[PDB]
């Protein structure tokens, strides 16, 4: 069956190449999660540096797309960087043409459309990545919008991605079932980060040092990533607890 | 590279046939039957719709019969959307001719250019052929009333009476039996419906499953009129010959 | 408005004997009322016993000579080192010149 | 399947090798070089007797000093002849001289590998190219669809070719006269031809420095046929 | 590099089926149920909003889309294919109609343009057919209200009422029973809500149900006043709250 | 651009698409051309499994390329329209630049070149067509008849046939055409041509077309009767 | 096997089979040798005929006054590659008034060959080349292979039975490297080298081809009676 | 070029066209036929820019002759005149426009009527009973306005033309070396040889 | 299956087998390494001596990009050159528009995107090299390694080719034993040692050592080849330690 090698339909209406691109998504064996504060949007992803020879500061799956948008990727790094470069270019072009900063959801729709094209046009392969976009949008507030190789996207209250994604997802549903709200009812992003790390620890049943995580925060008018030391300061507060 | 996935839509079989053309003809043979009959005083087109649900909007409809210009219409058997691509091409071709010469396009000339387009898809470009056969009904001041058909090969021929789509074998045998040269439009109407009535795969032929049209000299003096029958007019014509 | 042409002066002359030929030219190069150089040669050995000068606007002259020398080089490459006869050179140079019929080389050429 | 420009495991181009097979199916053509001229002759091979055999055109003028014969898929040769004629006339326009036979042959051969996925397949026809020029005198070249060309003292191409070439190996020497060479071409054509050689199903031609390239009328060739019979009977 | 895929990927088999169109229709069969009903003074189109996670915010994914102020669309099948079709549909309403005539196209014509786009994905080099079926509801001055279905092949049909997707066979039967040519828009809405309950297994409220109408002009939804001839979009998306109101009297 | 090499060489040195194009020709209705002392005749089978045909408007099997040359063919009908159009265009272009209508041999070479071109270009298949091209060079009275085929080879013929059962009618012509004595008249030539087709056709009903070409652009097609007179006439001379 | 349908496909062990098949056409080629001192560089090549009635195929091609090469394998590919070199040498002169370094010529050929080994539709070049030259850093010999690999050497040989001459040159190395200021000796050493590769055949006067370039010597080709001297 | 006229009478169109070809201060030719037969019942005369005139006329002739062979039919004069107008209308916005004016005279066999069309280089078409291009019209239009009747015979038409040519030989400043005259009627196109 | 016959096709496990086959070609190449030091980087490579006929010193394998970047690679050499040619174009275009010489991370992504692009289509083949490269910019020293998949990271030390495990093991040792830094001069010598050590796994043919470096203090931030005394000194040091 050559309907398995390119993006044409199988007899049961399926696109195998798209489905297999989803499997490539987990190759890295990393999980990520995102949640919304009152004021902020936090994203955390596991960081694994198995080789002693690597420079750990260059090992990242989180990207600053624009001054206001961050993106975390689940999937191999070459595809991840391809998607990041394009998103940066799209976000900057949008600003030049329309005179305002590209919203998170709009960039997500745009990257989702590009991915849709690779599912329909044969000479282009899908990218083996899931893209989680985050910001504090000036109209919509804290925002999480996620893209996959099917060209699907939607906004989330919170989300998780990776091999152990269903465990984190249910953990998060269970928290919101309880709190009865859409978000972390918290003032400081420091505490929203702490919530995020805590409910990841619980769901994954593992403990973290400062080099096992990677954290990005979105506030009004900036998205930034945390240093190892910032993360430590945050891990410390979780312990004394 | 991509060679691996190329069907080669424009090659010959070892018997010297064109696979894709043959398979398009097979596709067409399962489409609603269309019949064209030519009289001395006009032309009839009739076509059976593909099995209607009771909820289908029958009056604001069109599927089989299309106006090309004021002197030319077609009946369609095959993929509708393929047919609309070719129809808009033909409509445009007619208008270029009118613009260039200030005379309405002679029927054959329009028929030939549509058939030449079809032919191209069988020789170059590696795309699939259009899955359509047309019956052309029209009038011009050189040959009067004319019927042609064309099919996915880009071959065309002229007829006194002809069918396309499903059951053309049975239908052609019946037309051959009752057709005659001195015949009038109103007789040909009856013949068209009798033939569809016997060849249909449905239990009985009703107004909701039909499209119908005539091209007559039936306006005033030396000029021609196209009438695309409304549902009511079909309901009548079906009683007036007692098929209901 | 930019004028793509200039005039570098000088003058040249060719005479043919029974079994020899000369191509002569002065070595002065000028623009307007100034001397650029008192010794700038403008007559050249082009190979296969062909001497050439293209005199007038020197930038055009040099381009032509350069193109013709290069023509001789490829004649050898393409036709088994065959000697380019003078009559054949002449015809070749016609095509070099006429190729710029609508933006001419401003030179009088002698070989 | 697989690409039109593919190498076999033995390092040869599939499509080129296969075109060589089509050439082996072609009608025979022979040329012989002498210091008095080059002769080219061919087997016409009419597929049916109703066909007007003088319309079979497998020997062709390129320029006054160059002629050509062909074997294989001969319809493929029209555009090669056209290119050759243009190269020859163009050369004379640029240089006010005759184009060398070798240079002409090289130009035709440059087309040869201009195929792939530029034309869609190699040419299915070999050419014998014969002419004169002041630098290297009388010449015969075999131009293949590989893009290779060899100079030959004599050569046969087509179905009769391994037969005829063994024969040419024996009969050729550096002192043959034009007349000797004409007879030889007839002799060997008659050997390898299916039907019985006459002045209607085979044709001759030469190129001499003095009169350039000439195709022989059927009358002239008929007498050479008669003259060959008389020589053969006579020992 | 570059697209070496200049040949068709949909072709005729010996039986004369076009495989990739059949298979696209199969993808449409797997899709969530959607439907449309036409009334004397309105059209209603509706579908279920089947969520991906419960962490997803299903308002941000709108299955029922405005194309022009008088035309709306819903689908069944592959959602991403639908999204890009909506983008192209909106654009072609402008480039090939509004920019030429200064008014929005009539429903059959806009439908015709979408059908063309889908037909081209069925014959052009190096693409696959769209894996969706559309239902498009609209109004225009000289035709009034109309409802069309567009299929992967590019074929379109006008309907009184229909359904597509998972539960289409059952729902089409449910609609044949309840449809008459005197249904007033409020009644057509009520029938649509009934028909959808059959095909939804889970929660059934205004947060899992997406529904829009083509009805009267809505001057309150225009955004400006002062031009007498501009009277507002005939397309309205019912709110979550407005659906639940009708679900109590159900 | 769709690029694929469809016409390529097989291991044995055959180009299968060109050879399969000949099969398409083999399946076409028969056509035959016979040249006389002072004329050429073109006759063509028309398959009679089609009653209800309107023959006023249905495309004839012989086509005028210019007013002094005609072309008939066997094979795919739709392919032949492409060759006919290009030939007509070339005919007018030749008149425009050379101030003379085409020689028949020239028109033949042109059509043949077009056919060859389609056997070594990417993205196209060869023409499923062979042609017979006949007429008289401007201001000349020697008749001309040429044949082309899908490969692009072309040649001159005293008489020749192509299409289904052309092998049977070539057989006939081969023993009935005296090279030494061409049908010295119009009438004779039309007869031999009809005889050769009756070997293969069935009833001489709507089953035969004839077209006659005489010098200086004098071209006429016969009607049912005039042919039919030969059908009856030959059939009686038959019982022996 | 399943992975040799074109150049753009790797085998499961990381090989490029079409490139390997191109290398194989070189192996059937008639043998050619190159070697050089500090003052001159020489090419020697054994030519090959179709039969006793044909010419011997030329194997040596001049690229500029100071550079040229010999070929083994597909000769039309040599004509393409040598022609590309002629242009590159030419461009260097016209634009910069600079004779092209033999090392740069090597790099340009490598990059040209490489392009044909990474895209669909193409094929690798099916010819090997030995480039000699004398430039601003002295005499050079280079070995080109259509994998793209180019190598600078004191001496080498390619073609059928080229292994014979290759070992010989490996033995001779300390001797011929110092044949400075004596052309006819370097040639003799090269002619000897090539003789280690003959079988059932010996060097004749329309069989043998020699070229030399060096300190006060333009690249010049010797054939026919002009090689008798060395037979 | 310069003088081209046309008169339409009861049963024919008559074209008259000057014979001179002048360049600088030399009359290069006195027997020039400024006309092409487009089809057996359509004639076209032309005047204007050197080179452009013949090139354009011959280009139209080729096209109509192509149409004729393709359809085995002859286009009506009205149809040919519209084709010619459109060609000229395209030309006017080209990089280099054809500067050619024409008269088209045909006999329409479907209607049995003669027809005269005057088309200038801009693609300005009118059907007229009589027509002239260039300075000619400044004399002939008023003359014909007076002496022309719609039911005249081919012979009366020819006398009317004689009057026109006489006026032009009296008052025009250039010697146009007489005219070649051609009649287009139900039987085709013929040349009057003594004028 | 047949998922491995065409570039850019996902297998059912989510892999691109053609890239994985490109890697086998890299694994089959000679050993090359990079070491990051105090204020610079050092590059080294094992050049096999196929024959005595190879001219020593005259088949140079390390390549400079712009004026401040070195590149070395193992696998298909011509592919490596192709990648460097592209790198040179990318650097020229960056310096033309922005004036400053291209930063090393910026340069690494240029190579990354280009290499990644050759895993997107069936009409090209992936690169059959891994490439070690780096230099000094306004922010210090950077060392990178880039794979056929287009994957790259920053490194303390890096190694690829036939002796990659042995060299990696040796590299880990230095990083443990010198946690406060390595001088550019310690590194040049250590590089010599590791190439000599890694030559074990490839010891048929003997080999020529080639080294280069960029160092703020030692080369003034420019890329230079190590020759003469400094090279001989580093060979001597290496010979010491295999004994």
UniProtKB/Swiss-Prot annotation, chain A:
Instruction: Give GO BP annotations, semicolon-separated.
Output: proteasomal ubiquitin-independent protein catabolic process; proteasome-mediated ubiquitin-dependent protein catabolic process
Q: CDD domains in the record, alphabetically?
A: proteasome_alpha_type_6 (cd03754)
Question: Could you tell me which Pfam families the record lists for this protein?
Answer: Proteasome, Proteasome_A_N
InterPro entries in the record, alphabetically? Ntn_hydrolases_N, Proteasome_alpha, Proteasome_alpha-type, Proteasome_asu_N, Proteasome_sua/b, Proteasome_subunit_alpha6
Localized where?
Cytoplasm; Nucleus
Indicate yes or no for the key word Cytoplasm: yes
Q: Where is this cross-link: Glycyl lysine isopeptide (Lys-Gly) (interchain with G-Cter in ubiquitin)?
A: 222
For this UniProt record, the keywords arranged alphabetically read as follows:
Acetylation, Cytoplasm, Isopeptide bond, Nucleus, Phosphoprotein, Proteasome, Ubl conjugation
User: Chief location of this protein?
Assistant: cytoplasm
Question: Which residues are annotated as modified residue Phosphoserine in the UniProt record?
Answer: 227
Give the GO cellular component terms, alphabetically.
mitochondrion; nucleus; proteasome complex; proteasome core complex, alpha-subunit complex
Q: Which SMART domains match?
A: Proteasome_A_N
The answer to whether UniProt assigns keyword Phosphoprotein to this entry is: yes
- Domain of life per record: Eukaryota
Q: Which family does it belong to?
A: Belongs to the peptidase T1A family.
What does this gene product do?
The proteasome degrades poly-ubiquitinated proteins in the cytoplasm and in the nucleus. It is essential for the regulated turnover of proteins and for the removal of misfolded proteins. The proteasome is a multicatalytic proteinase complex that is characterized by its ability to cleave peptides with Arg, Phe, Tyr, Leu, and Glu adjacent to the leaving group at neutral or slightly basic pH. It has an ATP-dependent proteolytic activity.
An additional note in the Swiss-Prot or TrEMBL entry is: Present with 15200 molecules/cell in log phase SD medium.
Checking PANTHER family in the record gives: PROTEASOME SUBUNIT ALPHA/BETA
**UniProt-recorded name of the protein:** Proteasome subunit alpha type-1
Q: Which organism is it from?
A: Saccharomyces cerevisiae (strain ATCC 204508 / S288c)
Taxonomic lineage of the native organism: Eukaryota, Fungi, Dikarya, Ascomycota, Saccharomycotina
Swiss-Prot record, chain D:
> Do you know which Gene3D superfamilies this protein is assigned to?
Glutamine Phosphoribosylpyrophosphate, subunit 1, domain 1 (3.60.20.10)
The protein's predominant localisation is cytoplasm
Q: Which residues carry this modification: Phosphothreonine?
A: 47
For this protein, the record's SUPFAM superfamilies field holds: N-terminal nucleophile aminohydrolases (Ntn hydrolases) (SSF56235)
Name the protein family.
Belongs to the peptidase T1A family.
Please give the function described in this protein's UniProt entry.
Answer: The proteasome degrades poly-ubiquitinated proteins in the cytoplasm and in the nucleus. It is essential for the regulated turnover of proteins and for the removal of misfolded proteins. The proteasome is a multicatalytic proteinase complex that is characterized by its ability to cleave peptides with Arg, Phe, Tyr, Leu, and Glu adjacent to the leaving group at neutral or slightly basic pH. It has an ATP-dependent proteolytic activity.
Could you tell me what this protein is called?
A: Proteasome subunit alpha type-5
Provide the gene name from the record: PUP2
Curated annotation (Swiss-Prot), chain G:
State where the record puts the cross-link Glycyl lysine isopeptide (Lys-Gly) (interchain with G-Cter in ubiquitin): 188
The entry's function note states: The proteasome degrades poly-ubiquitinated proteins in the cytoplasm and in the nucleus. It is essential for the regulated turnover of proteins and for the removal of misfolded proteins. The proteasome is a multicatalytic proteinase complex that is characterized by its ability to cleave peptides with Arg, Phe, Tyr, Leu, and Glu adjacent to the leaving group at neutral or slightly basic pH. It has an ATP-dependent proteolytic activity.
- Subunit structure, interactors included: The 26S proteasome consists of a 20S proteasome core and two 19S regulatory subunits. The 20S proteasome core is composed of 28 subunits that are arranged in four stacked rings, resulting in a barrel-shaped structure. The two end rings are each formed by seven alpha subunits, and the two central rings are each formed by seven beta subunits. The catalytic chamber with the active sites is on the inside of the barrel.
The record's section on SUPFAM superfamilies has: N-terminal nucleophile aminohydrolases (Ntn hydrolases)
The UniProt family comment states: Belongs to the peptidase T1A family.
Phosphoserine PTM positions read 11
A GO cellular component annotation here is: nucleus
Where does the record place it?
Answer: Cytoplasm; Nucleus
Its main subcellular localisation, reduced to a broad class, is cytoplasm
Record keywords:
Cytoplasm, Isopeptide bond, Nucleus, Phosphoprotein, Proteasome, Ubl conjugation
Keyword field contains Ribonucleoprotein = no
Q: What else is known?
A: Present with 7210 molecules/cell in log phase SD medium.
Would you tell me the protein name for this molecule? Proteasome subunit alpha type-6
Q: Indicate yes or no for the key word Cytoplasm.
A: yes
Q: Give the species this sequence originates from.
A: Saccharomyces cerevisiae (strain ATCC 204508 / S288c)
From Swiss-Prot, chain I:
Bilayer-crossing regions: none
Subcellular location, in the record's words?
Answer: Cytoplasm; Nucleus
GO function terms (MF aspect): mRNA binding
A single GO BP: proteasomal ubiquitin-independent protein catabolic process
Superkingdom of the source? Eukaryota
**Does the keyword field hold Cytoplasm?**
yes
Which keywords accompany this UniProt record? Acetylation, Cytoplasm, Nucleus, Proteasome
Pull one GO CC term from this UniProt entry.
proteasome complex
PTM summary from the entry reads: The alpha and beta forms are probably products of the same gene with different post-translational modifications.
- Record has Ribosomal protein as a keyword: no
The similarity annotation says: Belongs to the peptidase T1A family.
Q: List other remarks.
A: Present with 12000 molecules/cell in log phase SD medium.
Record text on subunit structure and interactions:
The 26S proteasome consists of a 20S proteasome core and two 19S regulatory subunits. The 20S proteasome core is composed of 28 subunits that are arranged in four stacked rings, resulting in a barrel-shaped structure. The two end rings are each formed by seven alpha subunits, and the two central rings are each formed by seven beta subunits. The catalytic chamber with the active sites is on the inside of the barrel.
> What's its job?
The proteasome degrades poly-ubiquitinated proteins in the cytoplasm and in the nucleus. It is essential for the regulated turnover of proteins and for the removal of misfolded proteins. The proteasome is a multicatalytic proteinase complex that is characterized by its ability to cleave peptides with Arg, Phe, Tyr, Leu, and Glu adjacent to the leaving group at neutral or slightly basic pH. It has an ATP-dependent proteolytic activity.
* Full protein stretch here: 6 to 248 of 288
